[PDB]
């Protein structure tokens, strides 16, 4: 299935994932494309935060789900 991840920069990225896919695995896909380290990647779906040690089905993430990727910046 395909999901939609929107970054704070205003970018819509589509990622190919499965219902049994893990959040950490999704972060790896983001890291592989954007280059942003998984540690700085904070994924939120429908206001609910996603834990690395969880799966998509855990948060009821289905196809065409809109996720928000927040980057924990140390500086500002």
């Amino acid at each position: 299935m395909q999901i939609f991840v929107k970054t704070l920069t205003g970018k819509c990225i589509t990622l190919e994932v499965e219902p049994s896919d893990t959040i950490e695995n999704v972060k790896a896909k983001i890291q592989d494309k954007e280059g942003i380290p998984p540690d700085q990647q904070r994924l939120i779906f429908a206001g609910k935060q996603l834990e690395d040690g969880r799966t998509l089905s855990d948060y009821n993430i289905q196809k065409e789900s809109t996720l928000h990727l927040v980057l924990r910046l140390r500086g500002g």
Binding site: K6, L8, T9, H68, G76
Partner: protein, 79 residues
């Protein structure tokens, strides 16, 4: 798709639906209430810039679109 992320407390809020006819101050009100934003002891980060007094333009003028995000920062060690 209002993405409010208060990385000062690590609190993420739900996606709020915004409109062009919606007043900026109305949104700011919700921000100061729900999020806990403040126009005196807080800094509002809009996309990649700060909401300065010069930016008195409304939402439909600032450039709101399908993806609207507001970052709450400032406080002490940031401003």
């Amino acid at each position: 798709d209002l993405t409010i992320s208060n990385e000062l407390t690590g609190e993420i809020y739900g996606p709020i639906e915004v409109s062009e006819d919606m007043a900026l101050t109305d949104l700011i009100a919700l921000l100061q209430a729900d999020c806990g934003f403040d126009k005196t002891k807080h800094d509002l980060y809009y996309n990649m810039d700060i909401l300065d007094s010069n930016r008195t333009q409304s939402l439909k003028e600032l450039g709101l679109k399908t993806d609207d995000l507001l970052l709450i920062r400032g406080k002490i060690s940031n401003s």
